[PDB]
RNA sequence: UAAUUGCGAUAACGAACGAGACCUUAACCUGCUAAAUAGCCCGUAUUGCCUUGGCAGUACGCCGGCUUCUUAGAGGGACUAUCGGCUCAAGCCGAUGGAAGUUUGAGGCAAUAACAGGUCUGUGAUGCCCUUAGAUGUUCUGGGCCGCACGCGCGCUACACUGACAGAGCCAGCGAGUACUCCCUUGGCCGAGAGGCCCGGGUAAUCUUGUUAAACUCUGUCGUGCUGGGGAUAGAGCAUUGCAAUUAUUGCUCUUCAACGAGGAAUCCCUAGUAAGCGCAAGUCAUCAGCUUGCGUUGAUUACGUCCCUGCCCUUUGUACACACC
């Protein structure tokens, strides 16, 4: 269960463009992504939502290299 | 024969030519100071209990 | 003007094209104040043919399974005889339709 | 009313088998508990469990279930579990009349006694055997004990006027004590004897 | 309380109807007994001497529970596997004559009648109530 | 190896004075020491049942077992 | 009006639909009572939901069940599943759940499979079930 | 009894 | 990490195939849209028994109500979510919840470079050579491809009592069906049996069809004897398919009653509804399945590993090999 580059690359750009619009809740983050992105599969959308909500959990305690938002 | 009872506290890798044999460190559960190394043939978990016929052979490594 | 309790049967290989045909036909009749009965769902009839891949018999033995599926979605209505002629117009390719007065 | 009068006899008392209760369990040794499961009673052995998914999930299973499955082997008896249950039930009746003790009293001590405590392992020696006489884990000991008991009954009843109901039954009473004239005991002591030589 | 056919065990019920029919002692027999195989799949005639009467009791029992039945359906109901030798076994049906005359002769006993409206044979007004009466002979026999 | 299909007075007397001490009586037991056939064993099995010397434990088309009274 | 609820239980290919109506304590399956419909040795696997719960809790309930499809042992597992689901569902809708929560906890503590089904079907393959044909010389 | 050819060396 | 799948280090930066993604299918929906070629409740008529107020069946309803079960559409659902323990990270182990937590299970498609692999006897795909009117073209009659001192492979039935035989009890699923000539077949009668005659339904969720299959369960006979286990071989008679049945097409009745007591050196397949046991449907078909392709019933022992044997991928290293350790 390792995520490939397409999921990870897409997750990086979403966080920096819309940082405040999505929060620690996985259910809410699922509905933010599909509104502001074009995904042709529900399963692909689910994986994208899973990674981005994990990233902000570790953002909450100290910044991480490779992430920059306004 | 003065048979002794021992208990497993930690498992240290799997030995043998074909992986059948496993190596464990046992505790005599009557004198907590002493501890030795033994060899076992079957599947072993922590807190398992083994019966030892002789307590002077030990094992390599 | 005598009602005859018509029944219409449909057949096609596609599934999306057939469904929207029935969706508009029920609306074409509902607005006309006609008592309409639901679009029943007849069983899909799947037929398959299996044959061996190689044409000569050498090497390993491997087979493949072709498939084909058909759906019906037949519909019936209570209406006079002349009105139904103008209600079944403008049909597209693929779907076959058969009309039965069922008098 | 809705139930037969037979089952009304046991409903007042504690739940148990058709005749016998799983109370008053032996106090004889250690290291064999936690792998023979009697805390949860079962009416009939038959059950569609999930015991073949993990490593030790089958360790938490009634012993009668373990015994019943091993009784059906050798090609002809595949999937005929209903026939096996009939044989098992009758065998518990035979041992009860020949010994006032509980049938589970016979079954438990029989299994715990016919399990080898040492065995020789195969380490390559370029055509020879450097049998190191390793120890045996408790889980394998109970697994092999069930196989030894059942294979003895299948051997005896083959082409014999006797029936499997008591051929299996007579082994259990023999294996309850040090009878030494049973099939299981003959193989168990033989395996331990050769292991001692290769120490 | 009241009892019916479904309220009694099938094995003892058919045996009871064979015992009850001893006292009336009126069932036609066409002389086929003691010679017939009762089926092509078989090799020896049935052991019990009064097999013609036990079979009729069971046959009339299921027709009480089934709505329409003919000779063809009963031919394969009583069929079984056949040992063809060294070839794999198959399924073959029972004899036609055994089941046809055992219920044609049973027609005149006023137990069940024809069903020409759709086919087969159905149970009669007074025929069904007779098999109900013997249920209490078994139910309270306990 | 071969057993006896008929039961004589030399074998009849063994039954009514010896079966009073068995803990279990089965089809195998009769074939064991009286050296008689199984078919004869079944005939003697039911006839002595009603005489009130043995009682049934479990009944089946396959096996019969009896004990003391 | 009349109190009734419908539940169903499934197995490999055995469907057991049941309707529980407020009655007097009568249970019959496929018309016949529980005395008949089972193999003689398999009759034991039908009564467990009764003894663990008690006969006093079936005072005024009537259940009739029709089951078809599958095999002999598959059907008896389906009907025993409908009984467990029927008895707990009727009380939940119409009476206080102090029983229901006590019914649910006790029923699954003895056996979880009484309330949930086991998903198992077969897999098609081009060699048999899962094994291939014999090889000539490896 | 005795086979030649293929890859074999010494003893 | 199942993976050139990633975290990262960096004389490299940015990209293209393969993997993944994806598609079909098996598991979940008391929520939506619904249904007399699918069901239930209800209402009439009606039957038996207790009689109660009941229980179990029949026939009808076509706007009486409804869609849990059946059916096929639109969507929802799992993402490793939450918790505890390691780690900077990617990740791994256990638990709880849950229909489902190995990529959830099983499949389809599937890169570069290659083989003197198979096929001219599938093709009106094809070069060249050969024969073309005493024809290697076509057509009709008959035979052979099945012929048997012997070696080898894929299967079928058994060596029995955990069995055979006899009565009774009685449970599936995937599919197929009428022409310019009859294709699956209900019912009635005759018939030891296989079969025969006469009405009738279905171009098919409507009829065959609930395909009430087999194993299995209950009650009996035989009694360890290669015997009522086993059915090879061979005699006589009665039938169907076809223009034609002998070197028997197949089927039915009586009689004949061989070898075979778990199998040497060697050797194949397989991890959960899986092995094995048992049967059913389809293909080829006027008739013949011990074969294959699919379908369902019953349902286990043991491991949760390693490189010891037979092989595969990457790095360092050696070479007198390059047709490459034959």
H/E element, B49? strand B49-52
Helices D164-176, D81-98: inter-axial angle, 10-degree rounding: 50
Closest C-alpha to G81, from G2, G20, G9: G9
Q: Name the method of structure determination.
A: cryo-EM
Nearest nucleotide over every DNA/RNA strand to the D78 CA, judged by C1': I277
**Distance, CA of D169 to CA of D101 (rounded, Å):** 14
Chain B interface mutation, best of D129, D135, D143, highest count of B Cβ atoms under 10 Å: D135
Which residues are within 8 A (CB) of F38 and not within 5 positions of it... i.e. 6 or more apart?
A: D161, F27, F30, F31
A65 Cβ contacts chain I strand, under 7 Å: yes
Resolution of the solved structure (Å): 3.1
3-state secondary structure of A15: helix
* Chain centroid, CA G89 distance in Å: 13
3-state secondary structure of B4: strand
| D30-35 contacts at long range (C-beta below 8 A, 24 or more positions apart) | D30/B5, D30/B49, D31/B5, D31/B49, D31/B50, D31/B51, D31/D138, D32/D112, D32/D115, D32/D138, D32/D141, D32/D142, D34/B49, D35/D59, D35/D138, D35/D139, D35/D142
Q: Is G125 annotated to bind ligand? A: yes
Q: Let me know how long chain G is.
A: 138
**Distance, CA of D103 to CA of D172 (rounded, Å):** 10
F65 backbone dihedrals φ, ψ, rounded to 5°: -135, 140
CA distance G74 to chain E (A): 22
C-alpha dist (Å) from residue E127 to D112, E106, E110 = 64, 11, 6
Which residues are within 8 A (CB) of F54 and not within 5 positions of it... i.e. 6 or more apart?
A: F19, F25, F48, F66, F67, F68, F69
**Distance, CA of G93 to CA of E26 (rounded, Å):** 58
Quickly list H helices, chain B. Answer: none
Helices D138-157, D103-113: inter-axial angle, 10-degree rounding: 110
C-alpha dist (Å) from residue D150 to D157, D171, E122 = 11, 9, 54
Closest C-alpha to D47, from D25, D28, D62, D35: D62
**Distance, CA of E111 to CA of E123 (rounded, Å):** 6
Q: Which chains touch E (3 or more CB pairs under 8 A)?
A: G
Q: Let me know how long chain F is.
A: 69
Instruction: Kindly calculate the radius of gyration of chain A based on its CA atoms and give it in whole angstroms.
Output: 11
Q: Å between C64 CA and I201 C1'?
A: 38
Nucleotides of I under 7 A from a protein CB: 1, 3, 5-8, 19-23, 26-28, 30, 33-35, 37, 40-42, 47-50, 52, 54-59, 68-74, 76-82, 89-92, 99-100, 103, 105-109, 117-119, 122, 153-157, 160-163, 165-173, 175-176, 185-195, 205, 209-210, 212-225, 230-232, 251-254, 261, 267-280, 289-308, 325-326
Q: Å between E91 CA and I251 C1'?
A: 15
B17 Cβ contacts chain I strand, under 7 Å: yes
Q: How many CA atoms lie within 13 A of C33 on its CB side?
A: 0
Q: Does G36 touch chain E (CB under 8 A)?
A: yes
Strands G61-68, G27-29: parallel, antiparallel or unpaired by DSSP? parallel
**Distance, CA of G122 to CA of A20 (rounded, Å):** 49
3-class DSSP string for chain C? CCCCCEEEEEEECCCHHHHHHHHHHHHHHHCCCCCECCCCCCCCEEEEEEEECCCCCCCCCCEEEEEEEEECCCEEECCCCCHHHCCCCCCCCCCEEEEECCC
Residue D184 · residue D149 · CB < 8 Å: yes
Per the structure block, which two tokens stand in for C43? 């069983």
3-state secondary structure of F28: helix
3-state secondary structure of E6: helix
**Distance, CA of D93 to CA of D96 (rounded, Å):** 5
**Distance, CA of D25 to CA of B53 (rounded, Å):** 26
Helices E51-63, E96-107: inter-axial angle, 10-degree rounding: 70
């Amino acid at each position: 269960r390792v995520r490939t580059k397409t999921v990870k690359k897409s997750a990086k750009v979403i966080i920096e463009k819309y940082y405040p619009r999505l929060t620690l809740d996985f259910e809410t983050n699922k509905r933010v992504c599909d509104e502001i992105a074009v995904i042709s599969s529900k399963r692909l959308r689910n994986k994208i939502a899973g990674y981005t909500t994990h990233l902000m959990k570790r953002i909450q305690r100290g910044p991480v290299r490779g992430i920059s938002f306004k | 024969a003065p048979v002794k009872f021992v208990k497993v506290t930690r498992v240290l890798g799997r030995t043998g030519s074909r992986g059948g044999v496993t190596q464990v460190r046992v505790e005599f559960m009557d004198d907590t100071t002493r501890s030795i190394i033994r060899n076992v043939k079957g599947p072993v978990r922590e807190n398992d209990i083994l019966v030892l016929l002789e307590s002077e052979r030990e094992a390599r490594r | 003007p005598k009602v005859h309790k018509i029944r219409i049967t449909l057949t096609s290989r596609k599934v999306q094209s057939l469904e929207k045909v029935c969706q508009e036909l029920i609306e074409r009749a509902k607005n006309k104040d006609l008592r309409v009965k639901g679009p029943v769902r007849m069983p899909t009839k799947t037929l398959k043919i299996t044959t061996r891949k190689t044409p000569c018999g050498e090497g390993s033995k491997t087979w493949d399974a072709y498939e084909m599926r058909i759906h019906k979605r037949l519909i019936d209505l209570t209406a006079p005889t002349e009105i139904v002629k103008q209600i079944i117009i403008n049909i597209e390719a693929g779907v076959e339709v058969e009309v039965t007065i069922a008098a | 009313d809705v139930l037969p009068k037979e089952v009304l006899a046991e409903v007042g008392s504690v739940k148990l088998f058709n005749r016998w209760s799983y109370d008053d369990i032996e106090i004889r040794d250690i290291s064999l508990t936690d792998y023979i499961q009697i805390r949860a009673p079962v009416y009939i052995p038959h059950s569609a469990g999930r015991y073949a998914v993990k490593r030790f999930r089958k360790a938490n299973c009634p012993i009668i279930e373990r015994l019943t499955n091993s009784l059906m082997m050798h090609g002809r008896n595949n999937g005929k579990k209903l026939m096996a249950v009939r044989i098992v039930a009758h065998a518990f009746e035979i041992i009860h009349l020949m010994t006032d003790q509980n049938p589970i009293q016979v079954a438990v001590d029989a299994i715990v006694n016919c399990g080898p405590r040492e065995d020789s392992t195969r380490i390559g020696s370029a055509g020879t055997v450097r049998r190191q006489a390793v120890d045996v884990s408790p889980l394998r000991r109970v697994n092999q004990a069930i196989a030894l008991l059942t294979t003895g009954a299948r051997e005896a009843a083959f082409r014999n006027v006797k029936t499997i109901a008591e051929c299996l039954a007579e082994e259990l009473i023999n294996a309850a004590k040090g009878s030494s004239n049973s099939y299981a005991i003959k193989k168990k002591d033989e395996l331990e004897r050769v292991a001692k030589s290769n120490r | 309380g009241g009892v019916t056919v479904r309220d009694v065990d099938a094995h003892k019920f058919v045996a009871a109807y064979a015992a009850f029919l001893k006292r009336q002692g009126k069932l036609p027999v066409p002389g086929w007994v003691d010679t017939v195989k009762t089926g092509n799949a078989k090799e020896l005639p049935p052991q019990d001497i009064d097999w013609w009467y036990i079979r009729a009791a069971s046959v009339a029992r299921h027709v009480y529970l089934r709505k329409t039945v003919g000779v063809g359906r009963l031919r394969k109901v009583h069929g079984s596997a056949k040992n063809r030798g060294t070839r794999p076994s198959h399924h073959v049906d029972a004899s036609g004559s055994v089941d046809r005359k055992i219920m044609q002769a049973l027609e005149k006993i006023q137990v069940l009648e024809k069903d020409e409206e759709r086919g087969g044979r159905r149970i009669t007004q007074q025929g069904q109530r007779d098999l109900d009466r013997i249920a209490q002979t078994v139910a309270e026999a306990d | 190896a071969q057993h006896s299909v008929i039961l004589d007075k030399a074998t009849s007397d063994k039954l009514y004075k010896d079966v009073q001490s068995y803990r279990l009586v089965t089809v195998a037991t009769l074939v064991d020491r009286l050296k008689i056939n199984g078919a004869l064993a079944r005939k003697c099995l039911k006839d002595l049942e009603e005489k009130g010397l043995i009682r049934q434990v479990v009944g089946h088309s396959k096996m019969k077992i009896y004990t003391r009274a | 009006s009349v109190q009734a609820v419908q539940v169903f239980g499934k197995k490999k290919n055995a469907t057991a639909v049941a309707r529980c109506v407020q009655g007097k304590g009568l249970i019959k399956v496929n018309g016949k009572p529980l005395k008949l419909f089972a193999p003689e040795i398999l009759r034991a696997k039908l009564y467990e939901p009764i003894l663990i719960l008690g006969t006093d809790k079936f005072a005024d309930v009537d259940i009739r069940i029709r089951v078809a499809g599958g095999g002999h042992t598959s059907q008896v597992y389906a009907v025993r599943q409908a009984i467990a689901k029927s008895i707990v569902a009727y009380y939940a809708k119409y009476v206080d759940e102090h029983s229901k929560n006590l019914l649910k906890q006790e029923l699954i503590q003895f056996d979880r499979s009484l309330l949930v089904a086991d998903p198992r079907r077969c897999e098609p393959k081009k060699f048999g079930g899962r094994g291939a044909r014999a090889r000539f010389q490896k | 009894r005795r086979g030649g050819f293929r890859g074999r060396g010494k003893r």
